[PDB]
């Protein structure tokens, strides 16, 4: 009964797990593509200032 | 007098701006000398800007010119002396001999601008040179006449790694050697000068076999930057005049790299990408270009490189990554897990590998090495979280044969006897591919895993086999 | 002998004539010369100095015309005439340019006397419009056993050779080049491709290499390289893949087959960047020159395959782009992903783990697809990309108790992987691939075990030379497999497994 029980709950849990971590991949995904775009412009903003002079 | 004087018109930072008299305007890479109670600070001419102003970059210390302060005209690039007698010399960027063993006494002079070899004069080669340094030897050997490598971080190890290679390359090499630092400090300088005045390499009352020009990162930004040049050209003499072999060495080549980027910016170009100059291509291609294998004779460049904050997609260490034939990159993880070289096994690659050039052996026993370690690392992910408890007989088997593999790669340096104090140890290239053989057929894998740790060849991983037994 | 070939030259320079237009150097620095004269110049126009450098001018300015100097600094000096060459740049064409290594301005570099041409040809003149271009319909078979049935390659259309820096990217790119020769020997003059390299960037050293390379395989009378090495000036980079893109239009237009594989466009992009910004042009994003899109895609597009009404050329083209640490994000890669028709993906894991040629069979696409693949080729191996990607799903399940199902296709997956292996710098004709990658499809080499996948390889290869060469010819005439063909190769396979 336990042998059961607990393959059965490893199956529940990872199964939980995998949720968590996708929704752990959205959030970091967000915030990879904020940070992309804000490299982007920052650096851009360099060459603008040395340009500018 | 010559009647080319030119007066300063503007010191502004290294940048000093000369303003010759009538035609006479000394061309592009020419070098001016300005009399000063220093002695001759020298600047090498780089734009005309029109109207008779010429616009150059200083090789010493810009404090205290005065506007308007006389300035003579060498009449040609910055003109070293080269000769054999400038065997154990130590000579600064303008070629002075800063050792104070008086006047270098040189037959000839040659300019620091020599335009690469051409198309035509470029000869195939393939010889393999005999590294004696165990990761080295099997997973990505160099070879002669070609330009090796040694990329590497920040302090992962990088001075002991130069140290061995100078105590074995440079002994074994036949030809001179010259030694070349650019930008490095003036503690690993005292370091370097003393060390091979003590292995005999420099014998200053014997022969030299091998000149010395250090530069040294007290050293003004221009200067710097044309550092490197004054050392390709006493290497190129040795190539091509005296028709030796020559084994120059340049440390640490980033250094060149990022001198560019200086002087770049105070020329006023506008600056590319991660800050680098925009001539980051071309100026890398000339000194890379010019050191080269010829008809004439051997130059086989060793080139240090630092990696800056251990990112290897930066663009200085990218730039040179194309050019150097025998990569090893030196990586802080492999360092921190305690082997030492610290070169990353699965991140070293040579063009001289291939499986004729090496010979079958050779080739099917390293091939089985990148294949096991790289397996090894894809599984590490799997064994960190889940654990080892649904990893394979064939996994289990895998990992066990990939962590002895791992440690069998450090290996206890000569140099790395004041750093570690276990005796250095040597193997022989035909040793090192026999040693490896036999771990990866699993003729060793009775041995307890720590008697592969900081061993020689496989007869000395019997031998701590036998420690660790008492 | 040479005397007389040097009398015939002193013979061979006459007095010239009076010379239109002439300039002042105003300021040269940084190699952009900057020239105060020219009065009548036209634009990109070759210009020569007193020194003996050569330039183009490319930037008219509206009161000084600034050439960009094709040689070191030192070579003009401020104040000297520059002469007006007269002539946009432009490169000789020809077929005899067959077998030369020739620099950007085109002048001989191999060192095999005078280039023999038949035209020069501007070095910047525009695409195949609309019409004059007819889909492609013609394999063009690298004789890489996964380049050739997994992305297959067809003249006239540009796919890219993308992947990680030092991956032996050129290798890829190369072992085509060899392959080609199997075709070239013959006399069939609607087969030859005739491969033109382009090495752009690259240190001498290595082209030496190259050079020497296609000579041991015997392969340097259908190849023309044009060099443009890493010591050579910005300008002559810069121009290099244009130039070359001229060499190729001869073979185009002349209706012959070409490819022209633009080793690496990665860096031709920092050799505009260096021109761009050292002539003070507006900078753009990443610090590349503004229009940088427009540069590559320029470039790109003169590949082509003409219609039937112009002749039915082709221009094959394969750009090589270095992606600096595999991100494909970066400003220099995406552009050129997006200009290009494919991809392949050269992984640096897969090279680690011993897949050599390591095209990462999932991020490789090829979006002409069909059209190529010969048609034998096409009907033996429609299952193995199909088999493919299921092993690439089911491959992280190897970590147990796994059902017989996902058993099977772990089995059938790492057999076919091992099985697409090439060994490097040997290309292998199409007729051998056909009956390869059939045994892996049918399922015959699954009970084989992978160590004895290799030696399986060449065995079969032997075997069905000695059993049935005349299956073997059957195969590559024939070129459409028949199933009667089918029959008597799944008798093969069948007796070739047993033993």
């Known amino acids: ?53 | 007098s010559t009647p080319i004087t030119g007066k300063v018109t503007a010191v502004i930072g290294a940048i000093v701006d000369v303003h010759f008299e009538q035609s006479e305007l000394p061309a592009i890479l020419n070098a001016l000398e300005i009399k000063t109670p220093q002695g001759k600070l020298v600047l090498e001419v780089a734009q005309h800007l029109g109207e008779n102003t010429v616009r150059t970059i200083a090789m010493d210390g810009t404090e205290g010119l005065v506007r308007g302060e006389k300035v003579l005209d060498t009449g040609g690039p910055i003109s070293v002396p080269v000769g054999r007698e400038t065997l154990g010399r130590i000579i600064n960027v303008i070629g002075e001999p800063i050792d104070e063993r008086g006047p270098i006494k040189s037959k000839l002079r040659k300019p620091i601008h020599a335009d690469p070899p051409s198309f035509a004069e470029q000869s195939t080669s393939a010889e393999i040179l005999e590294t004696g340094i165990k990761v080295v030897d099997l997973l990505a050997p160099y070879a002669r006449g070609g330009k090796i490598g040694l990329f590497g971080g920040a302090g992962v190890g990088k001075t002991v790694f130069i140290q061995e290679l100078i105590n074995n390359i440079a002994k074994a090499h036949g030809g001179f050697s010259v030694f070349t630092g650019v930008g490095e400090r003036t503690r690993e300088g005292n370091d370097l000068y003393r060390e091979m005045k003590e292995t005999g390499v420099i014998n200053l009352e014997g022969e030299s076999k091998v000149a010395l020009v250090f530069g040294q990162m007290n050293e003004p930004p221009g200067a710097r930057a044309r550092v490197a040049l004054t050392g390709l050209t006493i290497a190129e003499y040795f190539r091509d005049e005296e028709g030796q072999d020559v084994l120059l060495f340049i440390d640490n080549i980033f250094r060149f790299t990022q001198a560019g980027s200086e002087v770049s910016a105070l020329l006023g170009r506008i600056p590319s990408a991660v800050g680098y100059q925009p001539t980051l291509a071309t100026d890398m291609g000339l000194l890379q270009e010019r050191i080269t294998t010829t008809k004439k004779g051997s130059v086989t460049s060793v080139q240090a490189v630092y990696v800056p904050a251990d990112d290897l997609t930066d663009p200085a260490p990218a730039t040179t990554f194309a050019h150097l034939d025998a990569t090893t990159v030196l990586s802080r993880g492999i360092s921190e897990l305690g082997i030492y070289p610290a070169v990353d096994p699965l991140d070293s690659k040579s063009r001289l590998l291939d499986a004729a050039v090496v010979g079958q052996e050779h080739y099917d026993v390293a091939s089985k090495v990148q294949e096991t370690l790289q397996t090894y690392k894809s599984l590490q992910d799997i064994i960190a979280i889940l654990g080892m408890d649904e990893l394979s007989e064939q996994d289990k088997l895998t990992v066990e044969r990939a962590r002895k593999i791992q440690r069998f790669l450090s290996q206890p340096f000569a140099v790395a006897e004041v750093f570690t104090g276990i005796p250095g140890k040597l193997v022989r290239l035909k040793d090192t591919v026999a040693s490896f053989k036999a771990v990866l057929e699993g003729k060793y894998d009775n041995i307890p895993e720590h008697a592969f740790y900081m061993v020689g060849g496989i007869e000395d991983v019997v031998a701590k086999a036998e420690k660790l037994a008492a | 002998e040479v005397s007389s070939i040097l009398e015939e030259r002193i013979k061979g320079v006459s007095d010239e004539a009076n010379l239109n237009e002439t300039g002042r150097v105003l300021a040269v620095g940084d190699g952009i010369a900057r020239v105060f004269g020219l009065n009548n110049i036209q634009a990109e126009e070759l210009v020569e100095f007193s020194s003996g450098v050569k330039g183009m001018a490319l930037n008219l300015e509206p009161g000084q015309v600034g050439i960009v100097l094709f040689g070191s600094d030192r070579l003009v000096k401020e104040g000297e005439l520059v002469k007006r060459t007269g002539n946009i740049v432009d490169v000789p064409v020809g077929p005899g340019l067959l077998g030369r290594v020739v620099d950007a301005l085109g002048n001989p570099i191999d060192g095999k006397g005078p280039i023999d041409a038949a035209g020069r040809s501007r070095a910047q003149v525009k695409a195949p419009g609309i019409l004059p271009r007819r889909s492609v319909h013609e394999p063009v078979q690298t004789g890489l056993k996964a380049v050739d049935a997994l992305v297959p390659i067809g003249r006239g259309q540009r796919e890219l050779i993308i992947g990680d820096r030092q991956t032996g990217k050129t290798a890829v790119a190369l072992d085509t080049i060899l392959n080609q020769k199997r075709w070239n020997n013959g006399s069939d003059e609607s087969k030859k491709l005739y491969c033109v390299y382009v090495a752009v960037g690259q240190k001498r050293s290595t082209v030496a290499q190259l050079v020497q390379t296609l000579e041991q395989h015997d392969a340097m009378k259908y190849s023309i390289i044009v060099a443009a090495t890493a010591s050579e000036a910005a300008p002559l980079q810069y121009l290099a893949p244009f130039t070359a893109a001229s060499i190729g239009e001869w073979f185009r237009d002349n209706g012959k087959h070409a490819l022209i594989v633009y080793d690496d466009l990665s860096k031709q992009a920092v050799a505009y960047r260096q021109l761009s910004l050292l002539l003070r042009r507006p900078p753009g994003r990443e610090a590349y020159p503004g229009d940088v899109f427009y540069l590559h895609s320029r470039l790109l597009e003169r590949a082509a395959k003409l219609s039937e009404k112009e002749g039915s050329g082709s221009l094959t083209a394969l750009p090589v782009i270095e992606t600096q640490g595999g991100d494909v994000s970066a400003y220099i890669p995406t552009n050129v992903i997006s200009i290009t028709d494919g991809q392949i993906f050269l992984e640096a894991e897969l090279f680690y783990k011993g897949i050599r040629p390591a095209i990462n069979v999932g991020l490789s696409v090829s979006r002409v697809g069909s059209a190529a693949q010969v048609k034998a080729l096409k009907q033996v191996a429609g299952s193995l990309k199909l088999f493919l990607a299921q092993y690439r799903e089911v491959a992280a399940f190897a970590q147990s108790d796994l059902d017989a199902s996902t058993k099977q296709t772990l089995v059938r997956g790492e057999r076919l992987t091992q099985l697409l292996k090439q060994n490097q710098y040997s290309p292998l004709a199409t007729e051998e691939q056909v009956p390869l990658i059939y045994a892996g499809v049918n399922g015959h080499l699954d009970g084989i075990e992978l160590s004895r996948i290799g030696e399986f390889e060449s065995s079969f290869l032997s075997y069905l030379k000695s059993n049935h060469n005349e299956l073997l010819t059957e195969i590559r005439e024939k070129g459409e497999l028949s199933k009667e063909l089918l029959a008597s190769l799944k008798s093969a396979t069948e007796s070739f497994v047993a033993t």
């Open chain 1, 1 to 53: 009964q336990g042998y059961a029980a607990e393959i059965s709950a490893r199956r529940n849990a990872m199964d939980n797990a995998s949720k968590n971590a996708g929704d752990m991949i959205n959030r970091y995904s967000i915030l990879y593509n904020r940070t992309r775009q804000a490299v982007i412009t920052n650096e851009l903003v360099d060459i603008i200032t040395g340009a500018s002079s």
